Amino acid sequence: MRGSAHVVILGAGTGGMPAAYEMKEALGSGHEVTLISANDYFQFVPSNPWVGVGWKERDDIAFPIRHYVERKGIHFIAQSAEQIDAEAQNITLADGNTVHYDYLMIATGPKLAFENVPGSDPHEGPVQSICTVDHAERAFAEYQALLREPGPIVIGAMAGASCFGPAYEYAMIVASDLKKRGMRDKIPSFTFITSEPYIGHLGIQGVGDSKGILTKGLKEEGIEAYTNCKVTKVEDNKMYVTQVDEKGETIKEMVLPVKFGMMIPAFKGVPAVAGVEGLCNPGGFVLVDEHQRSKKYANIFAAGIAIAIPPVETTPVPTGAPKTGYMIESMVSAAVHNIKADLEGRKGEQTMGTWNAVCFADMGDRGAAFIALPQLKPRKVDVFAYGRWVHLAKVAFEKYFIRKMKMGVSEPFYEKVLFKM
């Protein structure tokens, strides 16, 4: 509505939740802010690997959204968008209802593209996922089934994956949990399959000594590792893998039996968003400018995994660079600021800032973390760290993030990085 613009935020995840609060905080009581998401609960996704091995419960890492955002004056609709007509600016929900918007802020994260690898969907074979708590709970249940009936383990990342950290994390804690159950010696073979050109490439051409450290780690745990691999199909509990060389030629094909498995899938854009004509690249990722504004529709903004970021390298086997938390927050802040500026007749000039990747993996008593920026080398910061303190930090950050998602944020997010003052 004119003068009382209605802003809709699609997706209540790492970018979406904060976007809701920030938007409402910025616009005030004169504008309608509606948050629409497929689930009625928020989940802290960096914790999913731990759920997948049973180190955490769903209840530890998730909570119902409604109360917390409604107490802030945000309208919550727990329904997935099935369709977005950008011309009429209407969104059709799963239940057939439709919602109009004056501005749209898309934060739908990834579609897990299991279909790239026939048989790889967690519901159709032994290869599970820890990308969502629903999947991680299923991974754990299968993990227990491996405990009762031991057989070969296969963990890694598919062709086109962009989130490698968690595969390493999951492989280490599995190994770790297998020992603490005195069950490790009952595993016939524990294999790490990755699409990375080398161990610890991480989709970012490596950070610090991640190659050396992740390699050593997989050896400590007795995990055999293969790089430059694409899984072509999962079938009869066997993983068909092709391994290439620097020039894409095939150097071998393997068939790996799998009693228990977990492969990071490739990410695509969700269907409702990918389905909007001229909105997205062929991956279904929203093409936006420096200001987070759709290049096709001026009243559509995007943040998080949903946006497209051009590649800067090409690997023998296709891989993506990850989109991580601090950068997503920069995107969210910028989108909110610029939408606000639009509502006030200005060109918002705020941008995402410098590309960066930050990731924290907890392996139990200690953890690994990295910070890399910008995307291309030589970087301004290229750090890989390991220690008990990385563990303590992950723990503290999750405690913090979840609290903030309940109390609300205003909130130039990341006064966390102010533990100096």
Ligand X SMILES: Cc1cc2nc3c(=O)[nH]c(=O)nc-3n(C[C@H](O)[C@H](O)[C@H](O)COP(=O)(O)OP(=O)(O)OC[C@H]3O[C@@H](n4cnc5c(N)ncnc54)[C@H](O)[C@@H]3O)c2cc1C
Ligand Y SMILES: CCCCCCCCCCC1=C(C)C(=O)C(OC)=C(OC)C1=O
Rounded to a whole number of angstroms, the minimum distance from the CB of residue 166 to ligand [S] is: 6
Q: Is 165 in the site for ligand [S] (CB under 6 A)?
A: yes
Footprint of a second copy (CB under 8 A): 208-209, 330, 353-354, 356, 373, 377-389, 392-393, 419-421
Query: φ, ψ for residue 322 (rounded to 5)?
Result: -75, 155
Please check if 179 is assigned to a binding site: no
Contact criterion met (CB below 8 Å) for 258 and 239: yes
Rounded to a whole number of angstroms, the minimum distance from the CB of residue 288 to ligand [S] is: 15
Amino acid type, 27: L
Query: φ, ψ for residue 271 (rounded to 5)?
Result: -55, -45
- Indicate which of ligand X, ligand Y, ligand [S], none lies near residue 130 (CB less than 5 to 8 Å, by partner kind): ligand X
Provide CB contacts within 8 A for 329, sequence distance 6+: 15, 18, 413, 414
The structure tokens 């993030």 sit at 401
Q: Is 323 in the site for ligand Y (CB under 6 A)?
A: no
Binding mask 351-370 for ligand Y (x = CB under 6 A): -------x-x----------
Compare residues 111 and 238 and give the one whose CB is closer to ligand X.
Answer: 111
Provide CB contacts within 8 A for 120, sequence distance 6+: 114, 127, 158, 231, 233, 234, 263, 265
Site for ligand Y in 18-57 (CB under 6 A): 46
Rounded to a whole number of angstroms, the minimum distance from the CB of residue 407 to ligand Y is: 16
Q: Is 164 in the site for ligand [S] (CB under 6 A)?
A: yes
Provide CB contacts within 8 A for 25, sequence distance 6+: 72, 408, 409, 410, 411
Q: What is the DSSP string of 218-268?
A: HHHTT-EEE-SEEEEEEETTEEEEEEE-TTS-EEEEEEEE-SEEEEEPPEE
Amino acid type, 350: Q
Rounded to a whole number of angstroms, the minimum distance from the CB of residue 157 to ligand X is: 11
Rounded to a whole number of angstroms, the minimum distance from the CB of residue 17 to ligand Y is: 11
Binding mask 347-376 for ligand X (x = CB under 6 A): -----------xxx----------------
Contact criterion met (CB below 8 Å) for 333 and 412: yes
Please check if 13 is assigned to a binding site: yes
3-state secondary structure of 347: coil
Compare residues 259 and 323 and give the one whose CB is closer to Au ion.
Answer: 323
Contact criterion met (CB below 8 Å) for 239 and 86: no
Please check if 37 is assigned to a binding site: yes
Rounded to a whole number of angstroms, the minimum distance from the CB of residue 15 to ligand X is: 3
- Indicate which of a second copy, ligand X, ligand Y, none lies near residue 383 (CB less than 5 to 8 Å, by partner kind): a second copy
How far from 257 is each of 63, 120, 280, 404, CA to CA, in Å? 37, 13, 38, 44
Please check if 109 is assigned to a binding site: no
Please check if 404 is assigned to a binding site: no
- Indicate which of ligand X, ligand [S], Au ion, none lies near residue 11 (CB less than 5 to 8 Å, by partner kind): ligand X
CA pseudo-torsion sign 119, 123, 127, 129: positive
Compare residues 114 and 360 and give the one whose CB is closer to ligand Y.
Answer: 360
Q: Is 259 in the site for ligand [S] (CB under 6 A)?
A: no
Provide CB contacts within 8 A for 47, sequence distance 6+: 56, 60, 61, 398
Please return the burial class of 185, using the count of CB atoms within 10 Å of its CB with bins 0-12, 13-18 and 19+: exposed
Catalytic residues: 163, 359
**What distance in Å separates the CA atoms of residue 266 and residue 279, rounded to the nearest whole number?**
20
Q: Is 328 in the site for ligand X (CB under 6 A)?
A: yes
Angle at 63 (CA atoms; ends 404, 140), nearest 5 degrees = 120
- Indicate which of ligand X, a second copy, ligand [S], none lies near residue 164 (CB less than 5 to 8 Å, by partner kind): ligand [S]
Compare residues 191 and 356 and give the one whose CB is closer to a second copy.
Answer: 356
Q: Which of 74, 130, 231, 256 binds ligand X (CB under 6 A)?
A: 130
Please check if 394 is assigned to a binding site: yes
* Radius of gyration from C-alpha coordinates of the chain: 21
Q: Is 394 in the site for ligand Y (CB under 6 A)?
A: yes
Contact footprint for ligand [S] (CB under 6 A): 162-165, 202, 267, 305, 320, 322-324, 359
Query: Annotated binding residues for FAD, as ranges?
Result: 11-15, 37-38, 80-81, 305, 325, 394
Contact footprint for ligand Y (CB under 6 A): 14, 46, 325-326, 329, 358, 360, 371, 394, 397, 401, 416-417
Contact footprint for ligand X (CB under 6 A): 10-16, 36-39, 45-46, 48-49, 80-81, 107-109, 130-131, 163, 165-166, 270, 272, 304-306, 324-325, 328, 358-360
